[PDB]
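CORE FACILITY INTAKE
Project code: CF-77B
Contact: R.S. (postdoc)
Sample description: multi-component assembly, two entities in total
Requested service: structural model of the whole complex
Turnaround: standard
Below are the sequence entries exactly as provided by the requester. Do not edit them.
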Amino acid sequence: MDTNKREIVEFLGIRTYFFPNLALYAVNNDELLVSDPNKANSFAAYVFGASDKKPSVDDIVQILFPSGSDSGTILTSMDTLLALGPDFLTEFKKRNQDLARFNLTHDLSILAQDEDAAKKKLNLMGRKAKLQKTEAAKILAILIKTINSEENYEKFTELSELCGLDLDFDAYVFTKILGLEDEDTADEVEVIRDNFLNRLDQTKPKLADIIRNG
Amino acid sequence: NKREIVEFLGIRTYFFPNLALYAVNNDELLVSDPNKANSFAAYVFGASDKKPSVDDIVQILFPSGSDSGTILTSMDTLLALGPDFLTEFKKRNQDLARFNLTHDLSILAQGDEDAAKKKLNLMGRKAKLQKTEAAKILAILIKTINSEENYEKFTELSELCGLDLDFDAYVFTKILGLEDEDTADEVEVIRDNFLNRLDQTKPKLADIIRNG
């Protein structure tokens, strides 16, 4: 969107900040994901349980940055790249370089530009952001806490805060793509999954059925 | 017996309903003659620098004639205030047993504290993922109980602001001494969040918090 603001969007029961084009894809293509998942998008097929083939980095980047993406789409998807960790940081820097010609930049560019000191400054920034009363500030706080997490369990704990903004879909997608479900987190992942399924059961039962079954 | 947030004329609270009522009922006193006001209220609202006693706090949390819901809510407050209030918590819980009532976190007051806290940690993490205020309050309470140091306690109590329970976070900060060089900027945000609401109903009382 032609805005710099972090905004939650929704598509037919799927509320999302980090993955709007994935949500839209799934809403449009649910019958294809049921009936011929190998011809469907591999990121969507994996997330929704239609395929056990993990998407590539390229598959993910393509969904995050479709052709004709505007500045708000790019900046939002750059947040997603940061949350996705080191395999996506070179892509983040590329997208940030592209924006500079337009006098645009990612607001957390201090990371990519003494990372320890940036992360401590960001830690304080995120703690104050969370105390603000807006969704945009709370998303920023969760992003910072996720970036500053060192191990998977901490990262899962901080991403789980997305469920407090009814962003269970995003927490679920990150859990799937980053491999955060293990013996310690499994019961909590099940609650997150069930929160998302509770919304899906009302709008896209086919998608719910794939996630539950196959 | 459900955990229910309440409000008194601009003061939204879970943990301190009788403190909020006291402020509604003694507005003028706190603004105009605070040396005559209740010491816990006077301290919280910035009218006095004298810290309240344990008994002062307990009497506001458990007024004479308190019913079982009031008792159970205030026992949550005792647990959040920490080990200094555990003997009071156990006494209140023992008295409830005759009526077939108990606090739902009674395992804390029994054997093996460490094992109970590990079990409560997992329950709190699942509770926070539920979509109700009652479950989210339980999760914050557990996370506070399981915090050892002031900074961690402050971080977990700050989550009350996500339920617009800034008043409660502010009261706990005042009573537990959580404001220091590391937390002062965040305490100011929490205070201002509460005052932004209090300004709409009792601006002269909000002014005492700002200015003494």
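Facility notes:
- The interface with chain B takes residues 124, 127-128, 130-133, 138, 157, 160, 163-164, 166, 187-188, 191-192, 195 of chain A (CB under 8 Å).
- Residues 2 and 155 of chain A are 30 Å apart (CA to CA).
Invoice: internal transfer
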